[PDB]
Structure formats: structure tokens, C-alpha cells
PDB file of all heavy atoms in Angstrom:
ATOM      1  N   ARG A 139     126.765 -23.973 182.895  1.00 53.04           N
ATOM      2  CA  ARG A 139     127.229 -24.690 181.643  1.00 53.04           C
ATOM      3  C   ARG A 139     128.435 -25.599 182.086  1.00 53.04           C
ATOM      4  O   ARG A 139     128.885 -25.412 183.225  1.00 53.04           O
ATOM      5  CB  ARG A 139     127.700 -23.655 180.591  1.00 53.04           C
ATOM      6  CG  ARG A 139     128.900 -22.893 181.010  1.00 53.04           C
ATOM      7  CD  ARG A 139     129.038 -21.586 180.133  1.00 53.04           C
ATOM      8  NE  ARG A 139     130.355 -20.891 180.307  1.00 53.04           N
ATOM      9  CZ  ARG A 139     130.645 -20.122 181.215  1.00 53.04           C
ATOM     10  NH1 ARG A 139     129.579 -19.719 182.192  1.00 53.04           N
ATOM     11  NH2 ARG A 139     131.716 -19.434 181.303  1.00 53.04           N
ATOM     12  N   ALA A 140     128.867 -26.511 181.337  1.00 49.12           N
ATOM     13  CA  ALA A 140     129.839 -27.427 181.624  1.00 49.12           C
ATOM     14  C   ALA A 140     130.759 -27.772 180.506  1.00 49.12           C
ATOM     15  O   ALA A 140     130.340 -27.671 179.245  1.00 49.12           O
ATOM     16  CB  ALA A 140     129.130 -28.746 182.187  1.00 49.12           C
ATOM     17  N   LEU A 141     132.038 -27.944 180.841  1.00 51.81           N
ATOM     18  CA  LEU A 141     132.987 -28.541 179.912  1.00 51.81           C
ATOM     19  C   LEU A 141     133.571 -29.838 180.468  1.00 51.81           C
ATOM     20  O   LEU A 141     133.866 -29.793 181.669  1.00 51.81           O
ATOM     21  CB  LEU A 141     134.089 -27.469 179.787  1.00 51.81           C
ATOM     22  CG  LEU A 141     135.348 -27.809 179.045  1.00 51.81           C
ATOM     23  CD1 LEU A 141     135.114 -27.985 177.485  1.00 51.81           C
ATOM     24  CD2 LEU A 141     136.472 -26.700 179.368  1.00 51.81           C
ATOM     25  N   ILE A 142     133.564 -30.917 179.637  1.00 55.02           N
ATOM     26  CA  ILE A 142     134.076 -32.126 180.044  1.00 55.02           C
ATOM     27  C   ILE A 142     135.360 -32.328 179.178  1.00 55.02           C
ATOM     28  O   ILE A 142     135.409 -32.289 177.983  1.00 55.02           O
ATOM     29  CB  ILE A 142     133.180 -33.270 179.727  1.00 55.02           C
ATOM     30  CG1 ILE A 142     131.809 -33.043 180.588  1.00 55.02           C
ATOM     31  CG2 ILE A 142     133.728 -34.537 180.085  1.00 55.02           C
ATOM     32  CD1 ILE A 142     130.631 -34.070 180.251  1.00 55.02           C
ATOM     33  N   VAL A 143     136.539 -32.504 179.912  1.00 50.63           N
ATOM     34  CA  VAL A 143     137.746 -32.704 179.287  1.00 50.63           C
ATOM     35  C   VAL A 143     138.107 -34.183 179.497  1.00 50.63           C
ATOM     36  O   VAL A 143     138.285 -34.556 180.744  1.00 50.63           O
ATOM     37  CB  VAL A 143     138.743 -31.801 179.915  1.00 50.63           C
ATOM     38  CG1 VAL A 143     140.189 -31.958 179.217  1.00 50.63           C
ATOM     39  CG2 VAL A 143     138.378 -30.259 179.678  1.00 50.63           C
ATOM     40  N   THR A 144     138.104 -34.974 178.590  1.00 48.86           N
ATOM     41  CA  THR A 144     138.354 -36.485 178.663  1.00 48.86           C
ATOM     42  C   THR A 144     139.399 -36.959 177.769  1.00 48.86           C
ATOM     43  O   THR A 144     139.723 -36.596 176.721  1.00 48.86           O
ATOM     44  CB  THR A 144     137.023 -37.195 178.461  1.00 48.86           C
ATOM     45  OG1 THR A 144     137.130 -38.603 178.762  1.00 48.86           O
ATOM     46  CG2 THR A 144     136.462 -36.985 176.961  1.00 48.86           C
ATOM     47  N   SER A 145     140.037 -37.873 178.435  1.00 47.40           N
ATOM     48  CA  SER A 145     141.173 -38.659 177.764  1.00 47.40           C
ATOM     49  C   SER A 145     140.954 -40.174 177.667  1.00 47.40           C
ATOM     50  O   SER A 145     140.447 -40.683 178.711  1.00 47.40           O
ATOM     51  CB  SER A 145     142.483 -38.376 178.555  1.00 47.40           C
ATOM     52  OG  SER A 145     143.481 -38.923 177.822  1.00 47.40           O
ATOM     53  N   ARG A 146     141.381 -40.813 176.561  1.00 46.51           N
ATOM     54  CA  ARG A 146     140.962 -42.159 176.329  1.00 46.51           C
ATOM     55  C   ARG A 146     142.254 -42.838 175.689  1.00 46.51           C
ATOM     56  O   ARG A 146     142.835 -42.236 174.835  1.00 46.51           O
ATOM     57  CB  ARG A 146     139.826 -42.384 175.329  1.00 46.51           C
ATOM     58  CG  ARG A 146     138.655 -41.368 175.667  1.00 46.51           C
ATOM     59  CD  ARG A 146     137.469 -41.774 174.758  1.00 46.51           C
ATOM     60  NE  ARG A 146     136.368 -40.784 174.883  1.00 46.51           N
ATOM     61  CZ  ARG A 146     136.053 -39.832 173.979  1.00 46.51           C
ATOM     62  NH1 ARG A 146     136.530 -39.865 172.647  1.00 46.51           N
ATOM     63  NH2 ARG A 146     135.026 -39.056 174.255  1.00 46.51           N
ATOM     64  N   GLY A 147     142.560 -44.008 176.122  1.00 44.71           N
ATOM     65  CA  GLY A 147     143.739 -44.795 175.530  1.00 44.71           C
ATOM     66  C   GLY A 147     143.380 -45.218 174.151  1.00 44.71           C
ATOM     67  O   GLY A 147     144.330 -45.221 173.264  1.00 44.71           O
ATOM     68  N   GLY A 148     142.115 -45.548 173.912  1.00 43.96           N
ATOM     69  CA  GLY A 148     141.816 -46.117 172.600  1.00 43.96           C
ATOM     70  C   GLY A 148     141.145 -45.079 171.755  1.00 43.96           C
ATOM     71  O   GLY A 148     141.424 -43.902 171.867  1.00 43.96           O
ATOM     72  N   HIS A 149     140.529 -45.523 170.605  1.00 44.25           N
ATOM     73  CA  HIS A 149     139.950 -44.679 169.557  1.00 44.25           C
ATOM     74  C   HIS A 149     138.662 -45.085 169.105  1.00 44.25           C
ATOM     75  O   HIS A 149     138.123 -46.102 169.248  1.00 44.25           O
ATOM     76  CB  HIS A 149     140.993 -44.678 168.401  1.00 44.25           C
ATOM     77  CG  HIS A 149     140.816 -45.781 167.437  1.00 44.25           C
ATOM     78  ND1 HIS A 149     141.163 -47.048 167.819  1.00 44.25           N
ATOM     79  CD2 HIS A 149     140.191 -45.897 166.256  1.00 44.25           C
ATOM     80  CE1 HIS A 149     140.885 -47.954 166.835  1.00 44.25           C
ATOM     81  NE2 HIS A 149     140.323 -47.242 165.887  1.00 44.25           N
ATOM     82  N   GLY A 150     137.913 -44.044 168.632  1.00 45.71           N
ATOM     83  CA  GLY A 150     136.605 -44.154 167.963  1.00 45.71           C
ATOM     84  C   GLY A 150     135.448 -44.174 168.894  1.00 45.71           C
ATOM     85  O   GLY A 150     134.318 -44.632 168.561  1.00 45.71           O
ATOM     86  N   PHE A 151     135.667 -43.491 170.131  1.00 46.61           N
ATOM     87  CA  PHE A 151     134.586 -43.482 171.040  1.00 46.61           C
ATOM     88  C   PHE A 151     133.813 -42.062 170.853  1.00 46.61           C
ATOM     89  O   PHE A 151     132.778 -41.947 171.519  1.00 46.61           O
ATOM     90  CB  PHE A 151     135.133 -43.472 172.418  1.00 46.61           C
ATOM     91  CG  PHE A 151     135.789 -44.848 172.800  1.00 46.61           C
ATOM     92  CD1 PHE A 151     137.068 -45.085 172.857  1.00 46.61           C
ATOM     93  CD2 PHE A 151     134.850 -45.884 173.083  1.00 46.61           C
ATOM     94  CE1 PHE A 151     137.666 -46.357 173.239  1.00 46.61           C
ATOM     95  CE2 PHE A 151     135.319 -47.130 173.361  1.00 46.61           C
ATOM     96  CZ  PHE A 151     136.803 -47.324 173.548  1.00 46.61           C
ATOM     97  N   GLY A 152     134.320 -41.262 170.036  1.00 45.38           N
ATOM     98  CA  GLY A 152     133.563 -39.966 169.812  1.00 45.38           C
ATOM     99  C   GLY A 152     132.503 -40.111 168.764  1.00 45.38           C
ATOM    100  O   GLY A 152     132.259 -41.207 168.182  1.00 45.38           O
ATOM    101  N   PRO A 153     131.649 -39.073 168.485  1.00 44.55           N
ATOM    102  CA  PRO A 153     130.583 -39.017 167.523  1.00 44.55           C
ATOM    103  C   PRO A 153     131.066 -39.571 166.134  1.00 44.55           C
ATOM    104  O   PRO A 153     132.169 -39.139 165.729  1.00 44.55           O
ATOM    105  CB  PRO A 153     130.212 -37.528 167.391  1.00 44.55           C
ATOM    106  CG  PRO A 153     130.659 -36.986 168.767  1.00 44.55           C
ATOM    107  CD  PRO A 153     131.921 -37.752 169.188  1.00 44.55           C
ATOM    108  N   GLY A 154     130.275 -40.460 165.585  1.00 43.72           N
ATOM    109  CA  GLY A 154     130.651 -41.221 164.224  1.00 43.72           C
ATOM    110  C   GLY A 154     131.781 -42.195 164.329  1.00 43.72           C
ATOM    111  O   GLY A 154     132.236 -42.764 163.241  1.00 43.72           O
ATOM    112  N   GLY A 155     132.330 -42.363 165.503  1.00 44.37           N
ATOM    113  CA  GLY A 155     133.398 -43.334 165.811  1.00 44.37           C
ATOM    114  C   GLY A 155     132.872 -44.710 165.713  1.00 44.37           C
ATOM    115  O   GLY A 155     131.815 -45.044 166.030  1.00 44.37           O
ATOM    116  N   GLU A 156     133.790 -45.606 165.346  1.00 44.87           N
ATOM    117  CA  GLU A 156     133.496 -47.079 165.297  1.00 44.87           C
ATOM    118  C   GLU A 156     132.976 -47.750 166.691  1.00 44.87           C
ATOM    119  O   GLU A 156     132.173 -48.579 166.697  1.00 44.87           O
ATOM    120  CB  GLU A 156     134.599 -47.986 164.757  1.00 44.87           C
ATOM    121  N   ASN A 157     133.473 -47.075 167.673  1.00 46.00           N
ATOM    122  CA  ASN A 157     133.171 -47.540 169.098  1.00 46.00           C
ATOM    123  C   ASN A 157     132.252 -46.661 169.790  1.00 46.00           C
ATOM    124  O   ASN A 157     132.198 -46.811 171.098  1.00 46.00           O
ATOM    125  CB  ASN A 157     134.454 -47.814 169.760  1.00 46.00           C
ATOM    126  CG  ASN A 157     135.328 -48.848 169.174  1.00 46.00           C
ATOM    127  OD1 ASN A 157     134.735 -49.871 168.683  1.00 46.00           O
ATOM    128  ND2 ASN A 157     136.625 -48.633 169.117  1.00 46.00           N
ATOM    129  N   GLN A 158     131.495 -45.735 169.243  1.00 46.04           N
ATOM    130  CA  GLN A 158     130.678 -44.709 169.826  1.00 46.04           C
ATOM    131  C   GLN A 158     129.642 -45.274 170.802  1.00 46.04           C
ATOM    132  O   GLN A 158     129.473 -44.922 171.930  1.00 46.04           O
ATOM    133  CB  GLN A 158     129.894 -43.979 168.781  1.00 46.04           C
ATOM    134  CG  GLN A 158     129.178 -42.655 169.368  1.00 46.04           C
ATOM    135  CD  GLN A 158     128.387 -41.926 168.386  1.00 46.04           C
ATOM    136  OE1 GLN A 158     128.404 -42.165 167.198  1.00 46.04           O
ATOM    137  NE2 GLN A 158     127.556 -41.000 168.932  1.00 46.04           N
ATOM    138  N   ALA A 159     129.098 -46.478 170.399  1.00 44.98           N
ATOM    139  CA  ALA A 159     127.918 -47.137 171.179  1.00 44.98           C
ATOM    140  C   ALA A 159     128.533 -47.714 172.504  1.00 44.98           C
ATOM    141  O   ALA A 159     127.832 -47.844 173.462  1.00 44.98           O
ATOM    142  CB  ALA A 159     127.434 -48.251 170.351  1.00 44.98           C
ATOM    143  N   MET A 160     129.859 -47.960 172.549  1.00 43.45           N
ATOM    144  CA  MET A 160     130.586 -48.408 173.774  1.00 43.45           C
ATOM    145  C   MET A 160     130.944 -47.263 174.742  1.00 43.45           C
ATOM    146  O   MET A 160     131.427 -47.589 175.876  1.00 43.45           O
ATOM    147  CB  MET A 160     131.855 -49.170 173.311  1.00 43.45           C
ATOM    148  CG  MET A 160     131.619 -50.298 172.444  1.00 43.45           C
ATOM    149  SD  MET A 160     133.238 -51.108 172.023  1.00 43.45           S
ATOM    150  CE  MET A 160     133.470 -52.159 173.385  1.00 43.45           C
ATOM    151  N   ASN A 161     130.832 -46.063 174.322  1.00 41.73           N
ATOM    152  CA  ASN A 161     131.192 -44.869 175.219  1.00 41.73           C
ATOM    153  C   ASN A 161     130.145 -44.625 176.359  1.00 41.73           C
ATOM    154  O   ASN A 161     129.098 -43.902 175.988  1.00 41.73           O
ATOM    155  CB  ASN A 161     131.449 -43.715 174.431  1.00 41.73           C
ATOM    156  CG  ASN A 161     132.083 -42.509 175.213  1.00 41.73           C
ATOM    157  OD1 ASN A 161     132.072 -42.520 176.462  1.00 41.73           O
ATOM    158  ND2 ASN A 161     132.626 -41.480 174.602  1.00 41.73           N
ATOM    159  N   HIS A 162     130.416 -44.962 177.521  1.00 39.56           N
ATOM    160  CA  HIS A 162     129.439 -44.735 178.643  1.00 39.56           C
ATOM    161  C   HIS A 162     130.118 -43.868 179.615  1.00 39.56           C
ATOM    162  O   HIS A 162     129.822 -43.831 180.767  1.00 39.56           O
ATOM    163  CB  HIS A 162     128.975 -45.991 179.315  1.00 39.56           C
ATOM    164  CG  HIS A 162     128.282 -47.001 178.375  1.00 39.56           C
ATOM    165  ND1 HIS A 162     126.929 -46.954 178.162  1.00 39.56           N
ATOM    166  CD2 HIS A 162     128.607 -47.957 177.567  1.00 39.56           C
ATOM    167  CE1 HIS A 162     126.496 -47.718 177.305  1.00 39.56           C
ATOM    168  NE2 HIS A 162     127.531 -48.423 176.850  1.00 39.56           N
ATOM    169  N   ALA A 163     131.014 -43.039 179.161  1.00 38.34           N
ATOM    170  CA  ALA A 163     131.738 -41.980 179.995  1.00 38.34           C
ATOM    171  C   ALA A 163     131.085 -40.691 179.830  1.00 38.34           C
ATOM    172  O   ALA A 163     130.008 -40.351 180.513  1.00 38.34           O
ATOM    173  CB  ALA A 163     133.167 -41.975 179.641  1.00 38.34           C
ATOM    174  N   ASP A 164     131.535 -39.837 178.794  1.00 39.90           N
ATOM    175  CA  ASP A 164     130.971 -38.495 178.751  1.00 39.90           C
ATOM    176  C   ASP A 164     129.503 -38.487 178.279  1.00 39.90           C
ATOM    177  O   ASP A 164     128.682 -37.590 178.684  1.00 39.90           O
ATOM    178  CB  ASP A 164     131.869 -37.610 177.798  1.00 39.90           C
ATOM    179  CG  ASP A 164     132.271 -38.329 176.574  1.00 39.90           C
ATOM    180  OD1 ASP A 164     133.114 -39.168 176.468  1.00 39.90           O
ATOM    181  OD2 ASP A 164     131.651 -38.014 175.473  1.00 39.90           O
ATOM    182  N   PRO A 165     128.995 -39.443 177.364  1.00 39.85           N
ATOM    183  CA  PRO A 165     127.586 -39.413 177.152  1.00 39.85           C
ATOM    184  C   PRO A 165     126.826 -39.690 178.324  1.00 39.85           C
ATOM    185  O   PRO A 165     125.708 -38.994 178.427  1.00 39.85           O
ATOM    186  CB  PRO A 165     127.454 -40.476 176.070  1.00 39.85           C
ATOM    187  CG  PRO A 165     128.798 -40.634 175.517  1.00 39.85           C
ATOM    188  CD  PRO A 165     129.769 -40.399 176.567  1.00 39.85           C
ATOM    189  N   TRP A 166     127.216 -40.584 179.280  1.00 36.03           N
ATOM    190  CA  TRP A 166     126.400 -40.785 180.520  1.00 36.03           C
ATOM    191  C   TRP A 166     126.555 -39.504 181.414  1.00 36.03           C
ATOM    192  O   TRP A 166     125.553 -39.073 182.090  1.00 36.03           O
ATOM    193  CB  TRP A 166     127.091 -42.015 181.384  1.00 36.03           C
ATOM    194  CG  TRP A 166     126.655 -41.916 182.666  1.00 36.03           C
ATOM    195  CD1 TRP A 166     125.406 -42.200 183.138  1.00 36.03           C
ATOM    196  CD2 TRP A 166     127.358 -41.419 183.767  1.00 36.03           C
ATOM    197  NE1 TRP A 166     125.282 -41.876 184.515  1.00 36.03           N
ATOM    198  CE2 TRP A 166     126.411 -41.440 184.927  1.00 36.03           C
ATOM    199  CE3 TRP A 166     128.660 -40.889 184.024  1.00 36.03           C
ATOM    200  CZ2 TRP A 166     126.802 -41.061 186.139  1.00 36.03           C
ATOM    201  CZ3 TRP A 166     129.121 -40.582 185.347  1.00 36.03           C
ATOM    202  CH2 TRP A 166     128.065 -40.614 186.370  1.00 36.03           C
ATOM    203  N   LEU A 167     127.711 -38.798 181.477  1.00 38.14           N
ATOM    204  CA  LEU A 167     127.793 -37.596 182.217  1.00 38.14           C
ATOM    205  C   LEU A 167     126.869 -36.653 181.680  1.00 38.14           C
ATOM    206  O   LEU A 167     126.152 -35.896 182.461  1.00 38.14           O
ATOM    207  CB  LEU A 167     129.120 -36.935 182.186  1.00 38.14           C
ATOM    208  CG  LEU A 167     130.319 -37.598 183.084  1.00 38.14           C
ATOM    209  CD1 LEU A 167     131.735 -36.973 182.680  1.00 38.14           C
ATOM    210  CD2 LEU A 167     129.991 -37.354 184.567  1.00 38.14           C
ATOM    211  N   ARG A 168     126.671 -36.417 180.404  1.00 37.08           N
ATOM    212  CA  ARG A 168     125.775 -35.514 179.858  1.00 37.08           C
ATOM    213  C   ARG A 168     124.324 -35.904 180.389  1.00 37.08           C
ATOM    214  O   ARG A 168     123.567 -34.922 180.607  1.00 37.08           O
ATOM    215  CB  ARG A 168     125.705 -35.726 178.293  1.00 37.08           C
ATOM    216  CG  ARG A 168     126.788 -34.957 177.655  1.00 37.08           C
ATOM    217  CD  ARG A 168     126.366 -35.005 175.999  1.00 37.08           C
ATOM    218  NE  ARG A 168     127.336 -34.409 175.177  1.00 37.08           N
ATOM    219  CZ  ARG A 168     127.623 -33.132 174.875  1.00 37.08           C
ATOM    220  NH1 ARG A 168     126.728 -32.227 175.225  1.00 37.08           N
ATOM    221  NH2 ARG A 168     128.598 -32.786 174.099  1.00 37.08           N
ATOM    222  N   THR A 169     123.911 -37.084 180.335  1.00 36.68           N
ATOM    223  CA  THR A 169     122.548 -37.553 180.798  1.00 36.68           C
ATOM    224  C   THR A 169     122.309 -37.160 182.241  1.00 36.68           C
ATOM    225  O   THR A 169     121.349 -36.539 182.595  1.00 36.68           O
ATOM    226  CB  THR A 169     122.415 -39.096 180.589  1.00 36.68           C
ATOM    227  OG1 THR A 169     122.631 -39.379 179.279  1.00 36.68           O
ATOM    228  CG2 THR A 169     121.043 -39.542 181.004  1.00 36.68           C
ATOM    229  N   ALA A 170     123.340 -37.435 183.082  1.00 34.99           N
ATOM    230  CA  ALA A 170     123.110 -37.126 184.494  1.00 34.99           C
ATOM    231  C   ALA A 170     123.188 -35.657 184.732  1.00 34.99           C
ATOM    232  O   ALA A 170     122.323 -35.190 185.553  1.00 34.99           O
ATOM    233  CB  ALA A 170     124.286 -37.770 185.263  1.00 34.99           C
ATOM    234  N   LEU A 171     124.039 -34.884 184.108  1.00 35.58           N
ATOM    235  CA  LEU A 171     123.971 -33.507 184.200  1.00 35.58           C
ATOM    236  C   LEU A 171     122.842 -32.777 183.568  1.00 35.58           C
ATOM    237  O   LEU A 171     122.336 -31.913 184.272  1.00 35.58           O
ATOM    238  CB  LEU A 171     125.292 -32.938 183.600  1.00 35.58           C
ATOM    239  CG  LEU A 171     126.572 -33.138 184.087  1.00 35.58           C
ATOM    240  CD1 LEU A 171     127.803 -32.666 183.229  1.00 35.58           C
ATOM    241  CD2 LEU A 171     126.816 -32.718 185.516  1.00 35.58           C
ATOM    242  N   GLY A 172     122.272 -33.388 182.451  1.00 34.95           N
ATOM    243  CA  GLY A 172     121.078 -32.913 181.910  1.00 34.95           C
ATOM    244  C   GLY A 172     120.033 -33.070 182.920  1.00 34.95           C
ATOM    245  O   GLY A 172     119.007 -32.201 182.907  1.00 34.95           O
ATOM    246  N   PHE A 173     119.929 -34.176 183.621  1.00 35.81           N
ATOM    247  CA  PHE A 173     118.772 -34.411 184.516  1.00 35.81           C
ATOM    248  C   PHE A 173     118.660 -33.340 185.548  1.00 35.81           C
ATOM    249  O   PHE A 173     117.487 -33.037 186.046  1.00 35.81           O
ATOM    250  CB  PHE A 173     119.050 -35.749 185.076  1.00 35.81           C
ATOM    251  CG  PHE A 173     117.967 -36.274 185.965  1.00 35.81           C
ATOM    252  CD1 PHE A 173     116.694 -36.713 185.567  1.00 35.81           C
ATOM    253  CD2 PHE A 173     118.225 -36.302 187.402  1.00 35.81           C
ATOM    254  CE1 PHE A 173     115.647 -37.150 186.452  1.00 35.81           C
ATOM    255  CE2 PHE A 173     117.195 -36.825 188.366  1.00 35.81           C
ATOM    256  CZ  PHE A 173     116.013 -37.245 187.705  1.00 35.81           C
ATOM    257  N   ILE A 174     119.705 -32.736 186.021  1.00 36.29           N
ATOM    258  CA  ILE A 174     119.650 -31.722 187.123  1.00 36.29           C
ATOM    259  C   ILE A 174     119.673 -30.291 186.495  1.00 36.29           C
ATOM    260  O   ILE A 174     119.562 -29.340 187.158  1.00 36.29           O
ATOM    261  CB  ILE A 174     120.775 -31.871 188.064  1.00 36.29           C
ATOM    262  CG1 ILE A 174     122.181 -31.713 187.451  1.00 36.29           C
ATOM    263  CG2 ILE A 174     120.596 -33.131 189.007  1.00 36.29           C
ATOM    264  CD1 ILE A 174     123.339 -31.852 188.509  1.00 36.29           C
ATOM    265  N   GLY A 175     119.731 -30.191 185.141  1.00 35.71           N
ATOM    266  CA  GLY A 175     119.455 -28.852 184.501  1.00 35.71           C
ATOM    267  C   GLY A 175     120.754 -28.265 183.757  1.00 35.71           C
ATOM    268  O   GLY A 175     120.655 -27.175 183.322  1.00 35.71           O
ATOM    269  N   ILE A 176     121.837 -29.044 183.746  1.00 35.91           N
ATOM    270  CA  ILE A 176     123.033 -28.563 183.030  1.00 35.91           C
ATOM    271  C   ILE A 176     123.016 -29.171 181.606  1.00 35.91           C
ATOM    272  O   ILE A 176     123.549 -30.219 181.348  1.00 35.91           O
ATOM    273  CB  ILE A 176     124.187 -28.842 183.769  1.00 35.91           C
ATOM    274  CG1 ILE A 176     124.170 -28.278 185.164  1.00 35.91           C
ATOM    275  CG2 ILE A 176     125.479 -28.359 182.967  1.00 35.91           C
ATOM    276  CD1 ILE A 176     125.410 -28.657 186.021  1.00 35.91           C
ATOM    277  N   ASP A 177     122.410 -28.370 180.710  1.00 38.47           N
ATOM    278  CA  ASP A 177     122.313 -28.883 179.178  1.00 38.47           C
ATOM    279  C   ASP A 177     123.126 -28.050 178.192  1.00 38.47           C
ATOM    280  O   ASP A 177     122.905 -28.225 177.103  1.00 38.47           O
ATOM    281  CB  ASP A 177     120.757 -28.797 178.878  1.00 38.47           C
ATOM    282  CG  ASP A 177     120.196 -27.550 179.164  1.00 38.47           C
ATOM    283  OD1 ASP A 177     120.728 -26.484 179.021  1.00 38.47           O
ATOM    284  OD2 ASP A 177     118.994 -27.567 179.657  1.00 38.47           O
ATOM    285  N   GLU A 178     123.913 -27.135 178.674  1.00 37.69           N
ATOM    286  CA  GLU A 178     124.893 -26.621 177.825  1.00 37.69           C
ATOM    287  C   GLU A 178     126.273 -27.260 178.192  1.00 37.69           C
ATOM    288  O   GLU A 178     126.959 -26.787 179.108  1.00 37.69           O
ATOM    289  CB  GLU A 178     125.004 -25.131 177.985  1.00 37.69           C
ATOM    290  CG  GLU A 178     126.000 -24.390 177.149  1.00 37.69           C
ATOM    291  CD  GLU A 178     125.707 -22.762 177.048  1.00 37.69           C
ATOM    292  OE1 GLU A 178     124.582 -22.426 177.409  1.00 37.69           O
ATOM    293  OE2 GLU A 178     126.744 -22.156 176.880  1.00 37.69           O
ATOM    294  N   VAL A 179     126.578 -28.339 177.410  1.00 35.49           N
ATOM    295  CA  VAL A 179     127.759 -29.177 177.757  1.00 35.49           C
ATOM    296  C   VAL A 179     128.590 -29.240 176.532  1.00 35.49           C
ATOM    297  O   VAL A 179     128.082 -29.611 175.489  1.00 35.49           O
ATOM    298  CB  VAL A 179     127.279 -30.514 178.320  1.00 35.49           C
ATOM    299  CG1 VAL A 179     128.534 -31.313 178.709  1.00 35.49           C
ATOM    300  CG2 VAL A 179     126.461 -30.388 179.555  1.00 35.49           C
ATOM    301  N   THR A 180     129.914 -28.937 176.815  1.00 33.95           N
ATOM    302  CA  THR A 180     130.862 -29.183 175.702  1.00 33.95           C
ATOM    303  C   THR A 180     131.751 -30.263 176.080  1.00 33.95           C
ATOM    304  O   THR A 180     132.221 -30.369 177.305  1.00 33.95           O
ATOM    305  CB  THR A 180     131.655 -27.890 175.384  1.00 33.95           C
ATOM    306  OG1 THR A 180     130.700 -26.920 175.009  1.00 33.95           O
ATOM    307  CG2 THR A 180     132.659 -28.140 174.304  1.00 33.95           C
ATOM    308  N   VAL A 181     132.080 -31.160 175.092  1.00 36.59           N
ATOM    309  CA  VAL A 181     133.151 -32.229 175.290  1.00 36.59           C
ATOM    310  C   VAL A 181     134.326 -32.191 174.463  1.00 36.59           C
ATOM    311  O   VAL A 181     134.299 -31.992 173.292  1.00 36.59           O
ATOM    312  CB  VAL A 181     132.546 -33.644 175.140  1.00 36.59           C
ATOM    313  CG1 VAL A 181     133.626 -34.639 175.293  1.00 36.59           C
ATOM    314  CG2 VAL A 181     131.290 -33.902 176.036  1.00 36.59           C
ATOM    315  N   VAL A 182     135.504 -32.029 175.143  1.00 36.46           N
ATOM    316  CA  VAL A 182     136.792 -32.036 174.352  1.00 36.46           C
ATOM    317  C   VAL A 182     137.485 -33.355 174.831  1.00 36.46           C
ATOM    318  O   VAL A 182     137.701 -33.590 175.985  1.00 36.46           O
ATOM    319  CB  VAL A 182     137.571 -30.799 174.838  1.00 36.46           C
ATOM    320  CG1 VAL A 182     139.011 -30.936 174.230  1.00 36.46           C
ATOM    321  CG2 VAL A 182     136.901 -29.624 174.442  1.00 36.46           C
TER     322      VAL A 182
END
């Protein structure tokens, strides 16, 4: 399983945020990690 702890200077990059579509950080990590079989991922 994985925990991603991430910090951002700006706002609205999380789920339902105005800028969600621009977040290629933790959503990308989820994709790469999922590809190798880590699909229990939590983001804080």
C-alpha cells in the first residue's frame, strides 16, 4: 500500500478543486504506481 504526502503552494488541485485537471503530481503517481500493482494509495 502507499501513502503520498504532498505539499502545494497554490490551491484547488485536489478532488473537486477548480484546478484539479492541472494536477499531474499525485494523480500521475497513482497511475504509475497502479501499473506495477500498488492500488491501495492514500493522498494527504
Side-chain angles (χ1 to χ4, degrees), residues 139-155 157-182:
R139 64 195 192 279
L141 170 69
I142 297 169
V143 180
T144 184
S145 188
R146 318 188 185 113
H149 79 286
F151 291 108
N157 297 321
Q158 187 180 352
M160 306 178 81
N161 186 351
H162 298 275
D164 51 282
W166 165 73
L167 280 172
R168 282 190 185 269
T169 300
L171 293 174
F173 183 72
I174 61 178
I176 305 181
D177 50 41
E178 180 167 333
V179 179
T180 299
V181 176
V182 172

